[PDB]
Amino acid sequence: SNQAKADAVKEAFQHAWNGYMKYAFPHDELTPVSNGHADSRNGWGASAVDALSTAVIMGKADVVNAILEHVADIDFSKTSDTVSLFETTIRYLAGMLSGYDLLQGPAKNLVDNQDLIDGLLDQSRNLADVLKFAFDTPSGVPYNNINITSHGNDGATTNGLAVTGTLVLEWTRLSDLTGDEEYAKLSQKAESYLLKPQPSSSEPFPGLVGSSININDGQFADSRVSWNGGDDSFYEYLIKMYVYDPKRFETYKDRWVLAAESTIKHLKSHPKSRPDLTFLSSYSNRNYDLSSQHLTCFDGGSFLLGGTVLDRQDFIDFGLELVDGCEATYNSTLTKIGPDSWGWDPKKVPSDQKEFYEKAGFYISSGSYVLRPEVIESFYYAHRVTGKEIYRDWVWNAFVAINSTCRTDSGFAAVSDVNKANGGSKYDNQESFLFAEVMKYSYLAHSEDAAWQVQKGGKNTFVYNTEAHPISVAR
Numbered sequence: 001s002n003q004a005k006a007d008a009v010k011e012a013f014q015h016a017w018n019g020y021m022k023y024a025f026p027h028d029e030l031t032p033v034s035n036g037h038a039d040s041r042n043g044w045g046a047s048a049v050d051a052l053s054t055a056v057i058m059g060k061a062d063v064v065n066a067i068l069e070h071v072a073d074i075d076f077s078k079t080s081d082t083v084s085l086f087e088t089t090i091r092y093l094a095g096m097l098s099g100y101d102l103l104q105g106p107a108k109n110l111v112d113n114q115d116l117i118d119g120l121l122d123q124s125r126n127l128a129d130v131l132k133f134a135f136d137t138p139s140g141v142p143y144n145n146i147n148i149t150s151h152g153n154d155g156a157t158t159n160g161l162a163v164t165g166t167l168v169l170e171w172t173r174l175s176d177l178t179g180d181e182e183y184a185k186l187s188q189k190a191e192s193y194l195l196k197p198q199p200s201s202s203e204p205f206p207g208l209v210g211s212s213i214n215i216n217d218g219q220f221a222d223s224r225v226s227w228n229g230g231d232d233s234f235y236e237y238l239i240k241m242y243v244y245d246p247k248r249f250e251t252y253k254d255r256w257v258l259a260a261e262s263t264i265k266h267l268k269s270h271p272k273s274r275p276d277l278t279f280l281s282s283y284s285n286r287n288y289d290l291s292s293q294h295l296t297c298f299d300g301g302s303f304l305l306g307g308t309v310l311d312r313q314d315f316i317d318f319g320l321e322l323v324d325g326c327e328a329t330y331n332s333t334l335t336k337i338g339p340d341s342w343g344w345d346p347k348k349v350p351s352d353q354k355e356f357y358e359k360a361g362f363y364i365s366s367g368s369y370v371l372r373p374e375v376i377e378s379f380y381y382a383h384r385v386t387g388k389e390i391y392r393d394w395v396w397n398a399f400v401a402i403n404s405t406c407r408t409d410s411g412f413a414a415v416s417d418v419n420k421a422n423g424g425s426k427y428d429n430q431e432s433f434l435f436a437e438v439m440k441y442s443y444l445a446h447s448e449d450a451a452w453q454v455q456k457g458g459k460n461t462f463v464y465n466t467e468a469h470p471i472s473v474a475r
Ligand SMILES: *[C@@H]1O[C@H](CO)[C@@H](O[C@H]2O[C@H](CO)[C@@H](O[C@@H]3O[C@H](CO[C@H]4O[C@H](CO)[C@@H](O)[C@H](O)[C@@H]4O)[C@@H](O)[C@H](O[C@H]4O[C@H](CO)[C@@H](O)[C@H](O)[C@@H]4O)[C@@H]3O)[C@H](O)[C@H]2NC(C)=O)[C@H](O)[C@H]1NC(C)=O
Pocket: 276, 277, 317, 320, 323, 324, 325, 327, 328, 331, 386, 388, 390
């Protein structure tokens, strides 16, 4: 049953890994339609590193060894492109760190070469060392777009909320494993400005803050509140840091609880045509933006995690409502895959979507699907927290729809219109998170229990970074 399904996901992973190895390895990614390669992540082999934690969990030794051997020859000091501190941190840094915690722990019997495993930590350190100058600013808020050779930057005056608040988990984990406090100090200092917002007008409601921060003084530059892309990950890490080490980050939890409560009270929103559906809106100076993104669907999972860890049934209940809403965007389309963005503002319903809106509860703003995992991610937590089978089926239904409409001879491709036969047209693009997240959460939902699985209450020994890379908790 679930075993057969678990094997089905491993086949889909193997399928993409074979196509990647066949036409793109060691480049960052496979272009799934032309069977070529691309390097959108500085050329260190993003898809190989992002696939590591998933391969280890799936018990694929051959894949794990091939990746470890490539990690050994990476020179993180050379790249012809500018580097994103955020992208590099959540994929490469967390990816190697995850592999290390996994192979050194619950998966210790999977690989023989202990040198390739220790190399993961060494390379993680080398990577942080080449990037840390990004934090050398007046406030400590880093420049996200840097040139690692000249030490130059974007010239940017502000740094985004998510790009600033989604670094602490992996940089602190690096300090905890190396004994060198420098990494934790830098990221935590940048995070400090987000925990104590100034001006006070940048925090419209308790716990909800603006979307950008001034690099010079660390003050917020706007009061736009949102859980959408650009903001998302900041709130996610608030509660996750608490799970990582409740003794050191109790303060992060308090801030998350404030954010969670204000979100329920002010951002909660129901479509006119479907009062039974719940989505999150955006807020700016008293005005509400009645639209959301596939990216935002990570929210249900956040509420569920904090809910079970804090034993707050109200967060769990709200999280389930967010999960239902996102599930609604998936099962209402022709392909059974949800759109990249949608809206429910009665005054802006497109004429050609009027009837869709009346029955579904929303209209599609962008119908593309770029292999994102947020909806499956939240379905995964819903199942782990409630133990209900329905959420596991929703993961399966989504996986089959992706495998059926996105699959190509070499891998999986992004699609242009989830509300058209076969997804409209295929994009020649396969992001590394296909390996890291879509395949992992889909597999975990049907695989056996293990330390790396999300747990209820205070039993978690691993916490997932925003790219689905399991990191071992502190102590
Ligand atoms: C396509 O997407 C649809 C939208 O997500 C999805 O619809 C359903 O999805 C959920 C299916 O389980 C369903 O949620 C459940 O709703 C139960 C009934 O709700 C009604 O009664 C309650 C009274 O308490 C009212 O408050 C509601 O407004 C509504 O009138 C509810 O009993 C149930 O709660 C139990 O289970 C949860 C955990 O699963 C516990 O936490 C809880 O304590 C209860 O034990 C749960 O909330 C949801 O209502 C429904 N959505 C809508 C709007 O229709 C479709 O299933 C999906 N289609 C396919 C084919 O996949």
